[PDB]
Amino acid sequence: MDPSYDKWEMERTDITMKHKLGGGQYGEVYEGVWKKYSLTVAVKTLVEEFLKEAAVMKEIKHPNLVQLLGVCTREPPFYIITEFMTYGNLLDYLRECNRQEVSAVVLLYMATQISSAMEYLEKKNFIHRDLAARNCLVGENHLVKVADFGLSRLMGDTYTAHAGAKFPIKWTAPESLAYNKFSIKSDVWAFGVLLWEIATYGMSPYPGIDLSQVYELLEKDYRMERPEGCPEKVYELMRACWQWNPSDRPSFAEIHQAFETMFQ
Ligand SMILES: Cc1ccc(NC(=O)c2ccc(CN3CCN(C)CC3)cc2)cc1Nc1nccc(-c2cccnc2)n1
Numbered sequence: 278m279d280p281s282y283d284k285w286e287m288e289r290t291d292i293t294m295k296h297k298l299g300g301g302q303y304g305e306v307y308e309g310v311w312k313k314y315s316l317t318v319a320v321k322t323l324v325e326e327f328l329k330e331a332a333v334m335k336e337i338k339h340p341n342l343v344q345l346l347g348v349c350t351r352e353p354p355f356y357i358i359t360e361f362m363t364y365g366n367l368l369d370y371l372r373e374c375n376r377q378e379v380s381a382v383v384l385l386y387m388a389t390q391i392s393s394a395m396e397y398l399e400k401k402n403f404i405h406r407d408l409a410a411r412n413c414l415v416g417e418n419h420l421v422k423v424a425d426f427g428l429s430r431l432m433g434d435t436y437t438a439h440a441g442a443k444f445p446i447k448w449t450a451p452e453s454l455a456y457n458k459f460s461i462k463s464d465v466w467a468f469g470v471l472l473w474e475i476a477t478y479g480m481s482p483y484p485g486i487d488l489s490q491v492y493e494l495l496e497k498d499y500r501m502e503r504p505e506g507c508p509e510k511v512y513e514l515m516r517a518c519w520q521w522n523p524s525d526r527p528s529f530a531e532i533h534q535a536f537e538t539m540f541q
């Protein structure tokens with residue numbers, strides 16, 4: 278548009294829509310080419326929830342959060358356009374990677390990048406609410422960005438029903454399960470599970486544990502065991518993220534500083 282206004286609004290026809298991304302696992306999200314820049318992009322298409330997501334994305338900018346490039350929200354069909362990340366979601370990436378290439382230090386790097394995005398969300402007073410390897414993307418040179426694919430009602434037993442809502446029970450903090458309280462500290466809990474996913478090259482958390490007994494075990498102080506090869510200090514960080522009282526969990530500022538330190 279013309280300033281004589283929303284700088285994010287773009288020309289629908291600047292983009293050649295191609296096929297639905299990841300064989301339909303993200304819902305209405307398409308591979309596209311932003312012709313003017315010769316650039317492959319991801320395009321989410323369709324209201325209030327959709328317009329609210331666009332508004333949030335215009336408020337966030339960080340090298341490890343997926344980057345909004347533009348929107349088409351004047352008339353339907355509405356688009357939200359972001360960069361395309363070459364290697365796809367982190368969960369699949371970890372399962373399928375060359376483990377000699379994706380060594381302990383690369384896992385350290387992925388965790389540091391994600392804690393950096395989370396320290397930024399925290400500073401900005403945002404809550405992710407669904408942090409997990411399936412909502413992270415991998416680009417070149419093991420670049421990792423945090424995203425939010427609205428996976429609740431797309432995805433098996435990863436999400437399970439609660440009052441109109443579906444929750445990923447094995448990523449969900451005890452106070453979220455019991456009182457529907459979500460905060461940056463419930464993201465800290467989820468981050469601990471994400472760290473376990475990273476450490477195990479993408480294994481499912483609480484393997485074989487039925488969902489109905491997760492809260493009970495947590496309340497009895499059960500926590501997942503240290504993964505083979507996970508350094509003691511990284512496991513100690515995981516366990517701190519899984520403190521029963523949310524006020525006892527570290528901040529993302531602290532977590533990131535602890536990884537930044539190890540990484541350096
Ligand atoms: C095309 C698009 C549209 C919207 C979004 N949105 C987000 O990723 C996102 C990230 C953070 C927030 C912050 N938010 C704070 C408030 N709480 C409640 C929710 C989280 C919101 C949206 C991403 C994308 N990108 C996207 N989506 C699906 C798949 C892919 C993709 C797949 C494969 C390779 N490259 C990219 N890329």
Ligand SMILES: CNC(=O)[C@@H](N)Cc1ccc(OCc2ccccc2)cc1
Nearest residue numbers: 381382384385388475476507508511539
């Ligand atoms: C001299 N060498 C050293 O000091 C190494 N111990 C440095 C180092 C510290 C932590 C690491 O973490 C691996 C990891 C992180 C996140 C999730 C799973 C695994 C890796 C290397």
